[PDB]
Coordinates of C-alpha atoms in Angstrom, one line a residue:
Chain A
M1090 CA 14.2 57.3 31.6
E1091 CA 12.5 53.8 31.5
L1092 CA 13.2 51.6 28.4
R1093 CA 10.3 50.7 26.3
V1094 CA 9.8 48.7 23.2
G1095 CA 7.3 49.4 20.4
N1096 CA 4.6 51.2 22.3
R1097 CA 3.6 49.0 25.2
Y1098 CA 6.2 46.4 26.2
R1099 CA 8.3 47.8 29.1
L1100 CA 11.7 45.9 28.8
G1101 CA 13.4 44.1 31.6
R1102 CA 16.7 42.1 32.6
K1103 CA 18.2 39.5 30.5
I1104 CA 16.5 36.1 31.1
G1105 CA 18.7 34.1 28.6
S1106 CA 19.8 33.6 25.1
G1107 CA 18.6 31.6 22.2
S1108 CA 19.7 30.7 18.8
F1109 CA 18.2 34.1 17.2
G1110 CA 19.8 36.0 20.0
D1111 CA 18.7 36.8 23.7
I1112 CA 15.3 36.7 25.5
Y1113 CA 14.7 39.3 27.9
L1114 CA 12.1 39.8 30.2
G1115 CA 9.1 42.4 29.4
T1116 CA 6.0 43.7 30.8
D1117 CA 2.8 44.5 28.5
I1118 CA 2.2 47.9 30.5
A1119 CA -1.1 47.9 28.5
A1120 CA -2.6 44.9 30.5
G1121 CA 0.2 43.9 33.1
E1122 CA 1.2 40.8 31.4
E1123 CA 4.8 39.9 31.9
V1124 CA 6.1 38.1 28.7
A1125 CA 9.1 37.4 26.9
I1126 CA 10.7 39.5 24.3
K1127 CA 13.3 38.3 21.7
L1128 CA 15.5 41.0 20.0
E1129 CA 17.7 41.0 16.8
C1130 CA 19.9 43.6 15.5
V1131 CA 19.2 45.0 12.2
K1132 CA 22.7 43.7 10.8
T1133 CA 21.5 41.7 7.8
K1134 CA 24.5 39.2 8.4
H1135 CA 22.0 36.6 8.8
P1136 CA 18.7 37.9 9.7
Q1137 CA 16.2 34.9 11.0
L1138 CA 13.8 36.3 13.7
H1139 CA 11.3 36.8 10.8
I1140 CA 11.6 33.1 9.9
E1141 CA 11.1 31.5 13.3
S1142 CA 8.3 34.0 13.8
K1143 CA 6.6 32.5 10.9
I1144 CA 7.1 29.0 12.0
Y1145 CA 5.5 30.2 15.6
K1146 CA 2.4 31.4 13.7
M1147 CA 2.4 28.1 11.8
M1148 CA 2.4 25.9 14.8
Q1149 CA -0.1 28.2 16.5
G1150 CA -2.8 26.3 18.2
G1151 CA -1.0 23.2 18.8
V1152 CA -0.9 21.9 22.4
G1153 CA 2.5 23.1 23.8
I1154 CA 3.6 25.7 21.4
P1155 CA 3.9 29.1 22.9
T1156 CA 1.4 31.9 21.7
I1157 CA 3.2 35.0 20.1
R1158 CA 2.3 38.3 21.3
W1159 CA 3.6 40.9 18.7
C1160 CA 6.1 41.2 16.1
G1161 CA 7.9 44.4 14.7
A1162 CA 10.7 46.6 14.7
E1163 CA 12.2 49.1 17.0
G1164 CA 15.2 51.1 15.7
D1165 CA 18.0 48.7 15.1
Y1166 CA 16.0 45.7 16.5
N1167 CA 13.3 43.2 15.1
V1168 CA 11.1 42.3 18.2
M1169 CA 9.1 39.1 18.7
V1170 CA 7.3 39.2 21.7
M1171 CA 5.7 35.8 23.1
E1172 CA 4.0 34.4 26.2
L1173 CA 6.3 33.9 29.1
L1174 CA 6.6 30.4 30.6
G1175 CA 7.7 28.5 33.4
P1176 CA 11.0 26.8 34.3
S1177 CA 12.9 24.9 31.6
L1178 CA 13.6 21.2 32.1
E1179 CA 17.2 22.1 32.6
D1180 CA 16.3 24.5 35.3
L1181 CA 14.0 22.0 37.2
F1182 CA 16.8 19.4 36.6
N1183 CA 19.1 21.4 38.5
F1184 CA 16.6 22.6 41.0
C1185 CA 16.3 18.8 41.8
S1186 CA 20.1 18.3 42.0
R1187 CA 20.6 17.1 38.8
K1188 CA 18.3 13.8 39.6
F1189 CA 14.8 12.8 38.2
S1190 CA 13.1 9.7 39.5
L1191 CA 11.8 7.1 36.8
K1192 CA 8.1 8.5 37.4
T1193 CA 9.1 12.0 36.5
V1194 CA 11.2 10.8 33.4
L1195 CA 8.3 8.9 32.1
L1196 CA 5.8 11.8 32.9
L1197 CA 8.0 13.8 30.8
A1198 CA 8.9 11.6 28.0
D1199 CA 5.4 11.1 27.3
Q1200 CA 4.6 15.0 26.6
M1201 CA 8.1 15.2 24.8
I1202 CA 7.5 12.8 22.2
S1203 CA 3.9 14.2 21.5
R1204 CA 5.5 17.7 21.0
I1205 CA 7.8 16.1 18.6
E1206 CA 5.0 14.3 17.0
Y1207 CA 3.1 17.6 16.6
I1208 CA 6.0 19.7 15.2
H1209 CA 6.5 16.8 12.5
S1210 CA 2.6 16.7 11.4
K1211 CA 3.4 20.4 10.5
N1212 CA 6.2 19.3 7.9
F1213 CA 9.1 20.5 10.2
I1214 CA 11.8 18.9 12.2
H1215 CA 13.1 20.9 15.3
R1216 CA 16.7 20.0 14.8
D1217 CA 17.9 21.2 18.4
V1218 CA 16.2 19.0 21.1
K1219 CA 17.8 19.3 24.4
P1220 CA 16.6 20.2 27.8
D1221 CA 16.7 23.7 27.5
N1222 CA 14.2 23.7 24.9
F1223 CA 11.1 22.3 26.9
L1224 CA 9.7 24.5 29.3
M1225 CA 6.9 24.1 31.9
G1226 CA 4.0 26.3 31.6
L1227 CA 2.4 28.5 34.4
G1228 CA -0.6 28.3 36.4
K1229 CA -3.4 26.1 35.2
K1230 CA -1.0 24.9 32.5
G1231 CA 1.8 24.2 35.1
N1232 CA 1.6 20.5 34.0
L1233 CA 2.1 21.1 30.4
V1234 CA 5.7 20.7 28.7
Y1235 CA 6.2 23.5 25.9
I1236 CA 8.5 23.2 23.3
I1237 CA 10.6 26.3 22.3
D1238 CA 13.1 27.8 19.6
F1239 CA 12.4 27.0 16.1
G1240 CA 15.7 28.6 15.2
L1241 CA 17.3 25.7 13.6
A1242 CA 14.0 24.2 12.6
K1243 CA 13.9 23.0 9.1
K1244 CA 10.8 21.8 6.7
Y1245 CA 11.3 18.0 5.8
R1246 CA 8.5 17.7 3.3
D1247 CA 6.7 19.6 0.6
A1248 CA 3.8 21.0 2.7
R1249 CA 1.2 19.7 -0.1
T1250 CA 2.6 16.4 -1.7
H1251 CA 4.7 15.7 1.3
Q1252 CA 7.4 15.0 -0.9
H1253 CA 10.3 14.0 1.6
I1254 CA 13.6 16.0 1.1
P1255 CA 16.5 14.0 -0.5
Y1256 CA 18.9 11.8 1.4
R1257 CA 22.0 13.9 0.9
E1258 CA 24.8 15.4 3.0
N1259 CA 24.4 18.0 5.6
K1260 CA 24.7 21.7 4.4
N1261 CA 23.1 23.6 7.4
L1262 CA 23.6 24.8 10.9
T1263 CA 24.1 21.9 13.8
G1264 CA 22.6 22.0 17.2
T1265 CA 24.1 20.5 20.5
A1266 CA 26.7 18.0 19.9
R1267 CA 25.6 16.3 23.2
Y1268 CA 22.1 15.3 22.4
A1269 CA 22.9 15.2 18.6
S1270 CA 22.3 12.0 16.7
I1271 CA 24.8 9.7 15.0
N1272 CA 23.7 10.7 11.5
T1273 CA 24.3 14.4 12.5
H1274 CA 28.2 13.7 13.2
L1275 CA 28.4 11.6 10.1
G1276 CA 27.3 14.7 8.2
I1277 CA 23.9 13.5 7.0
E1278 CA 20.7 15.6 6.5
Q1279 CA 18.6 15.2 9.6
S1280 CA 15.1 14.1 9.5
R1281 CA 12.3 12.9 11.8
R1282 CA 14.2 10.1 13.3
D1283 CA 17.0 12.7 14.4
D1284 CA 14.6 14.3 16.7
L1285 CA 13.6 11.4 18.3
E1286 CA 17.3 10.0 18.7
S1287 CA 18.3 13.3 20.6
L1288 CA 15.2 12.8 22.8
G1289 CA 16.6 9.4 23.8
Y1290 CA 19.9 11.2 24.9
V1291 CA 18.1 13.4 26.8
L1292 CA 16.2 10.7 28.6
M1293 CA 19.3 9.2 29.4
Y1294 CA 20.6 12.5 30.8
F1295 CA 17.7 12.7 33.2
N1296 CA 18.3 9.2 34.4
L1297 CA 22.3 9.4 34.4
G1298 CA 22.8 12.9 35.6
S1299 CA 25.5 13.4 32.7
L1300 CA 26.3 11.5 29.3
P1301 CA 29.3 9.3 28.9
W1302 CA 30.8 11.8 26.4
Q1303 CA 30.1 14.7 28.4
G1304 CA 33.2 16.7 29.9
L1305 CA 35.9 15.9 27.3
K1306 CA 36.3 18.2 21.1
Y1307 CA 33.4 17.5 18.5
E1308 CA 35.5 14.8 16.9
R1309 CA 35.8 13.4 20.3
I1310 CA 32.2 13.6 21.2
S1311 CA 31.6 11.7 17.9
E1312 CA 34.0 8.9 18.6
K1313 CA 33.2 8.5 22.2
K1314 CA 29.3 8.6 21.2
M1315 CA 29.8 5.8 18.6
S1316 CA 31.8 3.8 20.9
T1317 CA 29.5 3.8 23.8
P1318 CA 27.1 1.0 22.8
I1319 CA 23.5 1.3 23.9
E1320 CA 23.4 -1.5 26.2
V1321 CA 26.3 -0.1 28.1
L1322 CA 24.9 3.5 28.1
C1323 CA 21.2 2.2 29.6
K1324 CA 23.1 -0.2 32.1
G1325 CA 21.0 -0.5 34.9
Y1326 CA 17.8 1.1 33.7
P1327 CA 14.7 -0.5 32.3
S1328 CA 15.3 -1.8 28.8
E1329 CA 12.7 0.7 27.5
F1330 CA 15.5 3.1 27.4
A1331 CA 17.7 0.9 25.5
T1332 CA 15.0 -0.4 23.0
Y1333 CA 13.8 3.2 22.5
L1334 CA 17.3 4.3 21.3
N1335 CA 17.8 1.2 19.4
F1336 CA 14.4 1.8 17.5
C1337 CA 15.5 5.2 16.6
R1338 CA 18.8 4.5 15.3
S1339 CA 16.7 1.7 13.2
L1340 CA 14.5 4.3 11.4
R1341 CA 15.3 4.8 7.6
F1342 CA 15.8 8.4 6.7
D1343 CA 12.4 8.9 5.4
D1344 CA 10.5 6.4 7.6
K1345 CA 7.4 7.8 9.7
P1346 CA 8.1 6.7 13.3
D1347 CA 5.6 4.7 15.2
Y1348 CA 4.9 7.4 17.7
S1349 CA 2.1 5.4 19.4
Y1350 CA 4.7 2.5 19.9
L1351 CA 7.4 4.7 21.5
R1352 CA 4.7 6.4 23.8
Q1353 CA 3.5 2.8 24.5
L1354 CA 7.0 1.5 25.6
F1355 CA 7.1 3.9 28.6
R1356 CA 3.3 3.7 29.4
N1357 CA 3.4 0.0 29.8
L1358 CA 6.5 0.4 32.1
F1359 CA 4.9 3.2 34.1
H1360 CA 1.8 0.8 35.1
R1361 CA 4.1 -1.8 35.7
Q1362 CA 5.8 0.3 38.1
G1363 CA 2.6 1.1 39.8
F1364 CA 2.9 5.0 39.2
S1365 CA -0.3 6.8 38.7
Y1366 CA -1.0 9.3 36.1
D1367 CA -1.2 12.4 38.5
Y1368 CA 1.1 15.1 37.3
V1369 CA 3.1 15.1 40.8
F1370 CA 6.7 15.9 39.4
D1371 CA 10.0 15.4 41.5
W1372 CA 9.9 19.2 41.9
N1373 CA 6.6 19.1 43.5
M1374 CA 7.8 16.7 46.0
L1375 CA 11.1 18.6 46.8
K1376 CA 9.2 20.8 49.1
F1377 CA 8.4 18.3 51.6
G1378 CA 12.2 16.7 51.6
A1379 CA 13.1 15.1 48.3
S1380 CA 13.1 15.4 44.4
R1381 CA 14.1 11.4 44.2
Chain B
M1322 CA 63.6 17.7 -8.4
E1323 CA 60.4 17.4 -6.7
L1324 CA 57.6 16.2 -8.9
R1325 CA 54.7 18.6 -8.6
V1326 CA 51.3 18.4 -10.8
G1327 CA 49.7 21.8 -11.4
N1328 CA 52.1 23.3 -9.0
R1329 CA 49.5 22.6 -6.3
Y1330 CA 50.2 18.8 -5.5
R1331 CA 53.3 16.6 -5.3
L1332 CA 52.9 13.2 -6.7
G1333 CA 53.6 10.2 -4.4
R1334 CA 53.6 6.5 -4.7
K1335 CA 51.5 4.8 -7.1
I1336 CA 48.2 3.7 -5.0
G1337 CA 46.4 1.6 -7.9
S1338 CA 44.8 1.7 -10.9
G1339 CA 41.5 2.9 -12.0
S1340 CA 39.5 1.9 -14.7
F1341 CA 41.3 3.9 -17.3
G1342 CA 44.0 5.6 -15.6
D1343 CA 46.6 5.3 -12.8
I1344 CA 46.0 6.4 -9.1
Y1345 CA 48.7 8.1 -7.4
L1346 CA 49.2 9.1 -3.7
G1347 CA 49.4 13.0 -3.7
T1348 CA 49.8 15.9 -1.0
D1349 CA 48.1 19.4 -1.3
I1350 CA 51.6 21.1 -0.7
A1351 CA 49.4 24.1 0.8
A1352 CA 46.8 22.3 2.8
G1353 CA 49.2 19.4 3.8
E1354 CA 46.1 17.3 3.0
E1355 CA 46.9 13.9 1.3
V1356 CA 44.7 13.3 -1.9
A1357 CA 44.4 10.8 -4.5
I1358 CA 45.6 11.9 -7.9
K1359 CA 44.2 10.2 -11.2
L1360 CA 46.0 10.7 -14.3
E1361 CA 45.2 10.0 -18.0
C1362 CA 47.6 10.4 -20.7
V1363 CA 46.9 13.2 -23.3
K1364 CA 47.4 10.7 -26.6
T1365 CA 44.6 7.9 -25.6
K1366 CA 42.0 7.5 -28.6
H1367 CA 39.5 6.9 -25.8
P1368 CA 39.8 9.6 -23.3
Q1369 CA 37.5 9.1 -20.3
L1370 CA 38.7 11.4 -17.5
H1371 CA 36.9 14.5 -18.7
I1372 CA 33.6 12.6 -18.7
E1373 CA 34.2 10.7 -15.5
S1374 CA 35.0 13.8 -13.7
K1375 CA 31.8 15.3 -14.9
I1376 CA 29.9 12.4 -13.3
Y1377 CA 31.3 13.0 -10.0
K1378 CA 30.5 16.6 -10.2
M1379 CA 26.8 15.8 -10.8
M1380 CA 26.8 13.6 -7.9
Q1381 CA 28.2 16.1 -5.6
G1382 CA 26.3 16.4 -2.3
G1383 CA 25.2 12.8 -2.0
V1384 CA 26.1 10.8 0.9
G1385 CA 29.0 8.5 0.2
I1386 CA 30.3 10.3 -2.8
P1387 CA 34.0 11.4 -2.8
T1388 CA 34.8 15.2 -3.6
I1389 CA 36.7 16.1 -6.8
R1390 CA 39.2 18.9 -5.5
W1391 CA 41.0 19.7 -8.8
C1392 CA 41.1 19.2 -12.3
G1393 CA 44.2 20.1 -14.5
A1394 CA 45.9 19.8 -17.6
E1395 CA 49.9 19.4 -17.6
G1396 CA 52.0 18.7 -20.5
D1397 CA 51.2 15.0 -21.2
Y1398 CA 48.4 14.2 -18.6
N1399 CA 44.9 15.2 -17.8
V1400 CA 44.6 15.5 -14.1
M1401 CA 41.9 14.7 -11.6
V1402 CA 42.2 15.2 -8.0
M1403 CA 39.6 13.8 -5.2
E1404 CA 39.8 13.3 -1.7
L1405 CA 41.8 10.2 -0.5
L1406 CA 39.5 7.9 1.4
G1407 CA 40.2 5.3 3.6
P1408 CA 40.8 1.5 2.9
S1409 CA 38.4 -0.5 0.4
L1410 CA 36.1 -3.2 1.4
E1411 CA 38.7 -5.9 0.1
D1412 CA 41.5 -4.4 2.1
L1413 CA 39.5 -4.7 5.4
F1414 CA 37.9 -8.2 4.3
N1415 CA 41.6 -9.2 3.8
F1416 CA 42.6 -7.6 6.9
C1417 CA 40.0 -9.5 8.8
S1418 CA 41.4 -12.9 7.8
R1419 CA 38.8 -13.1 5.0
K1420 CA 35.9 -13.5 7.2
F1421 CA 32.9 -11.2 7.9
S1422 CA 30.2 -11.7 10.6
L1423 CA 26.8 -11.2 9.6
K1424 CA 26.1 -8.1 11.2
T1425 CA 29.1 -6.4 9.5
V1426 CA 27.7 -8.0 6.3
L1427 CA 24.3 -6.5 7.0
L1428 CA 25.5 -3.2 8.2
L1429 CA 27.5 -2.8 5.1
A1430 CA 24.6 -4.2 3.0
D1431 CA 22.3 -1.2 3.9
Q1432 CA 24.7 1.5 3.2
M1433 CA 26.0 -0.3 -0.4
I1434 CA 22.3 -0.5 -1.5
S1435 CA 21.9 3.1 -0.8
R1436 CA 24.8 4.2 -2.7
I1437 CA 23.6 2.4 -5.7
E1438 CA 20.1 3.6 -5.4
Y1439 CA 21.4 7.1 -5.2
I1440 CA 23.5 6.4 -8.6
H1441 CA 20.5 5.2 -10.3
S1442 CA 18.6 8.3 -8.9
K1443 CA 21.0 10.3 -10.9
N1444 CA 20.4 8.6 -14.1
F1445 CA 23.4 6.4 -13.9
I1446 CA 24.3 2.7 -13.5
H1447 CA 27.9 2.1 -12.2
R1448 CA 28.6 -1.3 -14.1
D1449 CA 31.6 -2.4 -11.9
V1450 CA 30.2 -3.1 -8.6
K1451 CA 33.1 -4.8 -6.2
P1452 CA 34.4 -4.5 -2.7
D1453 CA 37.4 -2.8 -4.4
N1454 CA 35.2 0.0 -5.3
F1455 CA 33.9 0.9 -1.8
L1456 CA 36.1 2.6 0.8
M1457 CA 35.4 3.7 4.2
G1458 CA 35.7 7.3 5.0
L1459 CA 37.9 9.2 7.4
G1460 CA 37.8 10.5 10.7
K1461 CA 34.2 10.7 12.2
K1462 CA 32.9 9.6 8.6
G1463 CA 35.1 6.4 9.1
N1464 CA 31.6 4.6 9.5
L1465 CA 30.3 5.3 6.3
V1466 CA 30.9 3.7 3.0
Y1467 CA 31.9 5.4 -0.1
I1468 CA 31.3 4.5 -3.7
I1469 CA 33.8 5.3 -6.4
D1470 CA 35.1 4.8 -9.8
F1471 CA 32.5 5.9 -12.6
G1472 CA 34.8 4.8 -15.4
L1473 CA 32.4 2.3 -16.6
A1474 CA 29.4 4.5 -15.6
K1475 CA 26.7 4.9 -18.0
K1476 CA 23.4 6.8 -18.2
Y1477 CA 20.4 4.3 -18.3
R1478 CA 17.5 6.9 -19.3
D1479 CA 17.5 10.3 -20.6
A1480 CA 17.8 13.3 -17.8
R1481 CA 14.6 14.7 -18.9
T1482 CA 12.4 12.4 -20.7
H1483 CA 13.5 9.7 -18.1
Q1484 CA 13.1 7.3 -21.4
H1485 CA 15.2 4.0 -20.4
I1486 CA 17.9 3.0 -23.1
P1487 CA 16.7 0.7 -25.5
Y1488 CA 17.4 -3.1 -25.1
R1489 CA 20.4 -4.4 -27.4
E1490 CA 22.6 -7.8 -27.1
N1491 CA 25.7 -8.9 -28.6
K1492 CA 27.6 -6.4 -26.0
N1493 CA 30.8 -7.3 -23.9
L1494 CA 31.3 -8.2 -20.6
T1495 CA 32.1 -4.5 -19.5
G1496 CA 33.6 -4.9 -15.9
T1497 CA 34.9 -7.5 -13.5
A1498 CA 34.1 -10.9 -14.2
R1499 CA 33.8 -12.4 -11.1
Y1500 CA 31.0 -10.2 -9.9
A1501 CA 29.4 -9.8 -13.5
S1502 CA 25.6 -10.6 -13.9
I1503 CA 24.7 -13.4 -15.9
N1504 CA 23.0 -11.2 -18.4
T1505 CA 26.2 -9.4 -18.8
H1506 CA 28.0 -12.9 -19.6
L1507 CA 25.1 -13.2 -22.1
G1508 CA 26.1 -10.0 -23.6
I1509 CA 22.9 -8.2 -22.7
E1510 CA 23.1 -4.6 -22.3
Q1511 CA 23.2 -3.8 -18.6
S1512 CA 20.4 -1.8 -16.4
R1513 CA 19.6 -1.1 -13.0
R1514 CA 19.2 -4.9 -12.2
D1515 CA 22.7 -5.6 -12.9
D1516 CA 24.1 -3.6 -10.4
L1517 CA 22.0 -4.8 -7.9
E1518 CA 22.7 -8.5 -8.7
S1519 CA 26.7 -7.9 -8.7
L1520 CA 26.1 -6.6 -5.3
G1521 CA 24.3 -9.9 -4.5
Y1522 CA 27.7 -11.7 -5.4
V1523 CA 29.6 -9.1 -3.2
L1524 CA 27.2 -9.9 -0.3
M1525 CA 27.8 -13.7 -0.8
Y1526 CA 31.5 -13.3 -1.3
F1527 CA 31.6 -11.5 1.9
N1528 CA 29.5 -14.6 3.5
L1529 CA 31.4 -17.6 2.1
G1530 CA 34.9 -16.0 1.8
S1531 CA 35.1 -16.7 -2.0
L1532 CA 32.8 -17.9 -5.0
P1533 CA 32.4 -21.2 -6.9
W1534 CA 33.5 -19.5 -10.3
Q1535 CA 36.6 -18.0 -8.3
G1536 CA 39.8 -19.8 -9.0
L1537 CA 39.6 -21.7 -12.2
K1538 CA 39.0 -18.0 -17.9
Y1539 CA 35.9 -16.1 -18.4
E1540 CA 33.7 -18.8 -20.3
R1541 CA 34.8 -21.1 -17.1
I1542 CA 33.4 -18.4 -14.9
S1543 CA 30.1 -18.2 -16.8
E1544 CA 29.9 -22.0 -16.8
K1545 CA 30.1 -22.1 -13.1
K1546 CA 27.8 -19.3 -12.1
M1547 CA 25.0 -20.4 -14.4
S1548 CA 25.5 -24.1 -13.4
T1549 CA 25.2 -23.0 -9.4
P1550 CA 22.1 -22.9 -7.8
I1551 CA 21.2 -19.8 -5.8
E1552 CA 20.1 -22.3 -3.2
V1553 CA 23.4 -23.9 -3.5
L1554 CA 25.4 -20.8 -3.5
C1555 CA 23.4 -19.2 -0.4
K1556 CA 23.2 -22.6 1.3
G1557 CA 23.9 -22.2 5.2
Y1558 CA 23.1 -18.5 5.4
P1559 CA 19.9 -16.7 6.1
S1560 CA 17.6 -17.0 3.2
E1561 CA 17.3 -13.4 2.9
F1562 CA 20.3 -13.6 0.7
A1563 CA 18.6 -16.0 -1.7
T1564 CA 15.5 -13.9 -1.7
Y1565 CA 17.7 -10.8 -2.6
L1566 CA 19.2 -12.5 -5.6
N1567 CA 16.1 -14.2 -6.7
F1568 CA 14.7 -10.9 -6.9
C1569 CA 17.4 -9.2 -8.8
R1570 CA 17.5 -12.2 -11.4
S1571 CA 13.5 -11.7 -11.6
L1572 CA 13.7 -8.1 -12.5
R1573 CA 13.0 -7.0 -16.1
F1574 CA 15.5 -5.0 -18.0
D1575 CA 13.6 -1.5 -17.6
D1576 CA 12.6 -2.4 -14.2
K1577 CA 12.8 0.2 -11.5
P1578 CA 13.9 -1.9 -8.8
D1579 CA 12.5 -1.5 -5.2
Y1580 CA 15.5 -0.8 -3.1
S1581 CA 13.5 -0.2 -0.2
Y1582 CA 12.2 -3.7 -0.2
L1583 CA 15.7 -5.3 -0.6
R1584 CA 16.8 -3.0 2.1
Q1585 CA 13.9 -4.3 4.5
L1586 CA 15.0 -7.6 4.0
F1587 CA 18.1 -7.1 5.7
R1588 CA 16.7 -4.9 8.3
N1589 CA 14.5 -7.7 9.4
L1590 CA 17.1 -10.1 9.6
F1591 CA 19.3 -7.6 11.4
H1592 CA 16.4 -7.2 13.9
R1593 CA 15.6 -10.7 14.3
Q1594 CA 19.2 -11.8 15.2
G1595 CA 18.7 -9.3 17.9
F1596 CA 21.6 -7.2 16.9
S1597 CA 21.8 -3.7 18.2
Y1598 CA 22.7 -0.4 16.6
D1599 CA 26.3 0.4 17.2
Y1600 CA 28.8 1.3 14.8
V1601 CA 31.5 -1.2 15.6
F1602 CA 32.6 -3.4 12.7
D1603 CA 34.6 -6.6 12.7
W1604 CA 37.8 -4.8 12.0
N1605 CA 37.4 -2.7 15.4
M1606 CA 37.4 -6.0 17.4
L1607 CA 40.8 -7.3 16.4

C-alpha cells in the first residue's frame, strides 16, 4: 500500500539529509501541497527534533525562515513537517558550473547577512553557516534566500536580560570544518562573530570555486586556514571581501557586530560596479547561455 | 629501575621549578602523552600544592587554562600532573633574539589581558605576572596563550558576598621584583590593579628588550622604577602603552578595572597600523 505519515502527509523520496536526520519529500494529501518531512527515530540516544522544532516556532514570522506545517509522532518516528523550498545555494552553485559572478555574490551576500542578523536578534547563533543551509524560495518568493537547519543552533544570551554567555572553551557539537571560523578550530565557544566569519568563507567560496584548504584532516584544515593570510585568499577580488573577513576576525567575543556596515561595504561596491538591484541571478541568465 | 610516579607516569628530566615545587617532564606510560609533573615534599611546614591544584580545578573550562590530569600521594611527595604546554613567552622572546614586532606584541597583549580578566572573574589575583608564566599551546592550539602557576594566587574577594579583601600594608614583595608593581614595592596589599600594572611592564619589556631597573638588589630596582617616568619608559613607542600604565597606576585598591577599555586601546592601534588578523607571529617568520 501507499506509505503515509500521520493522517494526511503522503511520504515520498528522500531528498536529502541534515543534522537531525534526513529530509523526505512529502505531499499534504489534504490540500495537495508538496512539503518537506524531517524524520527522527525514537532512539533516545540524542533526541533533538523537538528542540530544533521549538527554535523554528520561535523564529517564525521572520523574513526567510521556513514555516513549520505540523509536528508529531508516527511509530518509531518524531516528525517535523515544513514548507518545501527551492534549490539550495550549493545546488545553484553546481547548476552554474561552480561559478558565481560578482553581482550574484553581492546580491546573495546582502540577504545572507540579514538572515544571520535576524537569527541573532532572536538570541541564537546558527553555528553551521554553509551554502547547503541557504535555500531560494519558490514562486512569488523565488527571489528570497531562506536559512534552514537549527540543529547546531545555540542561544548566545539570556532572552530577558540579554546576559551574554561566558568566554569559555567549547564543549558542544561542531559544524563544517571548511567554513569554520578560526575560534572554532582553537576550541573556543562560538558567538555572533563566528556566524559572520563563516559567511566570509562562503562568499570567497562562491568567488573562488574552492577554498585553499579544501581537498586535503581537521588538524590540517586548521593549519592551512591559519596559514593562508586573508590578503592572499581574497587576491584578485575587490578589497571588500578581505575587509569583510578582517572586520569579522576583529570582533571581540561578546561584541555586537555592525551589520549595517557589513551590508554597506557590498552595497557601495555594487553601485560602483554599475549593477542594478533587479533580482536577476546567474541561474536566471543561464537559460540564454551563461551563468557568468 | 624505571622511576614511576603513581604507577601511571614515568619521571623525566627536571624541566624547571614552580613557585613552591619542582617541575619534571613526565610520560603517561599508558597514553604515551608527555605531561608536566609538579612535586611537593610531604614534609614542608607550608604545603601549597593541595591548594594550587584546587585553584586550577575551579578554573577548568576557561580558555587558556591548562588541565590537571592527576593528583597523587607517593611516599615522600604529593603529586600534581597537568598537561605540558609549549614554550613560554620568554623562551620564544629569547629564541627571537630578544625582539618582538609591534603586532606580535599587540596580538599577545589581547590574549594576556583576557587571561587576567578571567582569573579576576573567578575571585582571584595571580600576583606573579611575567613572560615565564605564559605558554603557547600545542598543535592547532599553538596560537593560544595559556596562563600558569597559581602558587601565589589569592582570593581578592569573598566568593558569595564579593566583598573585597581589606586594605593592608607592611606586606612583603610576593613575586618577581622585575615586574612587581610599585604598590607592591611599597609593601601594600595587592589587588587587581597590580596584576595589570605588572602586565604593563611585561609589554614594555617586550618592546624595549629589557628594563631600567634590570641589571643593577630589590631596593635598587624600586629606586629605578620609581625614578623612571612612564613617558621616559615608553619613549619611542605608541602612547597606548603609556596610556595603559597610567590607567593601571591610577586605579584604586578595590577598583574593578575596565579590561575592555585597555583592550580597546591595543585594538585601536592594531587597526590604525593597518595590521591584518592572521595568526603568524615573529617566531614563525624565522
